[PDB]
Amino acid sequence: QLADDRTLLMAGVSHDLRTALTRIRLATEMMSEQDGYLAESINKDIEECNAIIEQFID
Amino acid sequence: AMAAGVKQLADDRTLLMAGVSHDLRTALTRIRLATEMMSEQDGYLAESINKDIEECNAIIEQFID
């Protein structure tokens, strides 16, 4: 009943979060084989962040 | 339940956004931990990630909080 203004805001937010998370994914894609379980963890947490944004910020 | 101020409380999204904020910060905190655990030869990568994490936090601090 005050909506579309923070709808736009939230699209901005979603955009900036996704941009930064994508940079993170990019960085993990360059991690070594020894750091595999770490990369895997980080990506699982990125996926989870994106799910949170998708559902409650979209 | 049809009381005048029930509908107002139910449309309050404060609690919801506080939970969004918290779940994001939780997941990001796990990313921070994982970076802090990386081999020291990939420090560059770690720092890169941390900057982005701090960027995300700021976003969340600035607009979801």
Cβ burial B19-35 (10 Å sphere, 16+ → b, else e): ebbeebbebbebbbebb
The CATH number of A1-58, from 3.30.300.30, 1.10.287.130, 3.40.190.10, 2.40.50.140, is 1.10.287.130
3-state secondary structure B15-61: HHHHHHHHHHHHHHHHHHHHHHCCCHHHHHHHHHHHHHHHHHHHHHH
Chain A touched by B15 (CB under 8 Å): no
Please indicate if any CB of chain B lies within 8 Å of the CB of A50: no
8 Å CB contact of A13 and B37:
no
Closest-CA distance of chain A to residue B31, Å = 5
Architecture of the domain spanning B1-65: Orthogonal Bundle (1.10)
Q: Does A18 touch chain B (CB under 8 A)?
A: no
What resolution in angstroms, rounded to 1 decimal?
A: 2.3
User: Measured on CA atoms in the order B57, A10, B16, B8, is the torsion positive or negative?
Assistant: positive
Spell out the domain ranges in chain A.
1-58
Interchain CB distance below 8 Å, A32 and B53: no
List the determination method.
Answer: X-ray
